[model samples]
Target: MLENYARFITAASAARNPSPSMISLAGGLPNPNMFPFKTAVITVENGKTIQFGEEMMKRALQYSPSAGIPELLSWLKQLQIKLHNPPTIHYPPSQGQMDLCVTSGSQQGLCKVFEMIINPGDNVLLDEPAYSGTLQSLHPLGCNIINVASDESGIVPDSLRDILSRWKPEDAKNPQKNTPKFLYTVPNGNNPTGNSLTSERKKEIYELARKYDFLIIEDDPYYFLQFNKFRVPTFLSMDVDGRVIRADSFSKIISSGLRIGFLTGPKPLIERVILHIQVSTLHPSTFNQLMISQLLHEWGEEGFMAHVDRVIDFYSNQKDAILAAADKWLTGLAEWHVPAAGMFLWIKVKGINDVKELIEEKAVKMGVLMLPGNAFYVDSSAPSPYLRASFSSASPEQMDVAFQVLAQLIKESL
Candidate 1:
């Protein structure tokens, strides 16, 4: 299929190079002088920041390569090397080199992956309680979305094997006749269920992907916020078959407004996403990319790791606060595990059947806001007693008050 589509890009590829002396009409590039603001500054860490001078601003105001700014891409590639130690040949060997492409947040990467891989009716699997943002994106793609079972550590290998083993015989006529395409997971502190997958669990999933001949998409945004460990092993690091597509984000750490993220995977797979990005968005914001590039350049890997430590410290404190409040106020009314990492606390109320109504009708009226569990599921109409509370931006006092209202509401519902 991809081979048949290659011819259409001939004209687009021709635009990549033009005579140096030849001017201007083929591609529209605005004059950088028109951009206001002589200088820009970004605070990377406490007592540390980067300034984008005139030359920097000009580069930023202009268009960039679809893959990303060259320097940043190189830097991120090295970061992956140090973090994941991904599969690569040594001693001047060449093939299956892991590479990355920048995206306007990881959500865009997710969209392009679906575009590049899935045809209508192809099967895509996700762990139960998967991120709602992903569920929303896959809905319009017409794929047969399947949800595998999840435990405290996420996608239970046994459950996944069971589902994959008998899927064909269970389907009437095996209509699509296609096995699962890929299994998508938010392994670190999953969205509605603050669960993290251990290294052993990752190995089992990777093995299953190999056995089943499907790909594994690792949508990890909260790897750094783990309060219990320095950093858990990632699927990208463990993948020996070149089958894992790992999405890394700055949104959860630096800032979401920055709109910076990258996808690292097999070069062939990433190149397809780059082609799709060539016309759409073209590239992420040049100024934002430069700011991040400068930040990485200055911080280096060690300082960046240190900064993550501070972020972990702060979020861990918040986690403690939320847990303390829940233990105090809602002991019998609700049940939740001690979140190992990330911002959400997944709570299952004792008796409430539908939390969507609980939030819109009762919780919101009490000056508290939460995401009902139904929103995160593939099937929204299914009854879910769960509700997700974010502790990242909420004050400890606010969390206490919110859960108090929640406790009374659950008691009344009972």
Candidate 2:
């Protein structure tokens, strides 16, 4: 039932000689001296500091275990308990139950999970106008990537049920040899849409997955970046059957360059991912793991949530500024929902047919840049009238200019 991975297993098995004088040159590991950050220190704005002293330097510069360092893995395990409160809760997880492992990033976890689950002609359900990174990963697998309709509340439960119900029916549009293996969804501040799933709807989707016996991959990179007074209940939190695999990241919250993330799921599935990690990339940056681990240890849960609060406050102001600019500039030319969470503002142009061309030929020509919605769709070449703008990077003044240019172009096109 698995692909040919015996070559890797044989090679790994061969390299495990217990000789005391083993001059192992089998793996192409780079020398640690080549790294410049032998002595690193990080200081947060809130006056918290962590240092990579000589001990840390030696540990971080060496080859780390595929699963991750004991300390970091333990921290993340505790984090999952605090965040999701999974059943049979135990660090290192119970023998073969729910567990967590560090990935280079959540993107790698997404890629690996897709590789593990999908086969040619296999079917999987995805959100329409999905996150491009996910679409890119899933496309090469040759799986039947069904896109379900969505509204302001994100993936419509009714649409999802309808699609699954008619999978093998006479008039089915995308008939397949099997039911969908899993549903990939971004529950919090979904990309290209900035819509969060309601708790009621989440239970509905989870029940659907349960009734159908399919897994749920919750790729929630924007979980902590929410603007709501209270956080939404995650699918993982509601996962009594251990069918939900959640991927999380520190990129948006800390630094993308750190290139560190983790996947929490059934230990058997994570064990497969660990094998892949053992051969490919080996491990996430040891330096990042040390830094993040120390940060988590020092901050604890209350402090971490407090830091997230500051981040939320900042983005909340930015969202307000961008929406205000849209109101002042693109009032009647176009329309968009005031995003409740996430950094993107999704827009629907009044009359434009190909938003991709409009952005390239006209929007950029007018000194403004935006992502056309088709890039997020399953078929990138499809025509779309939607646009996505980010409030995370641009200033209020720049956002004003960009929307003004967008407004003028839409008016002219009309």
Candidate 3:
């Protein structure tokens, strides 16, 4: 899913992480305001901050293992027991996860995945107007991109089948060339779109992947963050075919700065990705990894989930605020799904011919900023008429002002 411009585009996406003073409906950073900020003040500013930092430095700042610190790995394993993930019976050793490498974040996981499979000029399929950051990351990989059509149900299985059926491999022309490697997706509560793939659809998609021979990259950062449905099953949890590379990050589910994420695949491919990680960042920041592991251990299982539920409650109120704003100011004028879960509210405003124009001249112009839909597409030349708003960061009062102004702006366009 490489794009026209190369390096800068990718770097720009990474830059979207840390919040600027400006309104950023960009990268998925939980509003720092929403963090247990009061507690962090006690933890990070008080004497405890120094103790925590010193302990982290003594234990984790140095190169521990490409596999990870033994205690932290054990902690991750123990926590997995609560989630019913495969129990980590053995001690932490070797290349880890049999083959997978721990990445700085899920963003890097997707980047390495592109490097692993996409041949130059390959027709890589994207879930249209997908994660802008992901498109930006893959931009340097130089794949001949194809934006696969999707409906409200995330990746439309039939649409995928249609695309694959039409797209004959290079071997159709050469009779000896190879098929395209994969189709990528953010399976749970996808970025910008906020549409999650259902378990039934996942099974259908699995069959499609099996039939088409294209691997499925099941990026599931928000799998546990489901607000509407308490129990959302994951592709990795259900998968038996070894075709889906279940990528997870501590960003959405935990803290973003830690930059810890992992990918699950067949052992051999996982090992290759591990080697790639070794070359890139050399096993993530051990400090960051251990800090996360510390949090997990400190909270334990029930306490951790209860804490997550608290966070979700905060975001739930924010989501309501945004949707309530939409209902009041922009309901009939816009088309959107009240996301079952996640921090984003993907709204397709009616009658707006140009989204970039709206973002430049109106969104930011009104002192509210959102990443334009144009930036997300692998093919920038293609039509993109959607806008992604974040309830993750902004105050409900701020969202009210933002949407009111934005609604008026859209009405003008109409």
Q: Order of candidates by TM-score, top first?
A: 1, 2, 3
The better-scoring model by TM-score among 1 and 2 is 1
Residue-wise C-alpha lDDT for candidate 2, range 268-386, written one tens digit per residue: 56767777777678888887888888888888888888888998999999999999999999888788887867899999998778878778998877778899898898888889999
Residue-wise lDDT of candidate 1 within 329-379, one digit each (tens)? 999888898787789999988877887888889888888887889888889
Quantify all predictions' global Cα lDDT against the true fold.
Answer: 0.81, 0.80, 0.66
Give lDDT tens digits, candidate 3, residues 303-325: 67776787778878888888988
Select the stronger candidate by lDDT from 1 and 3.
1
TM-score of 2: 0.88
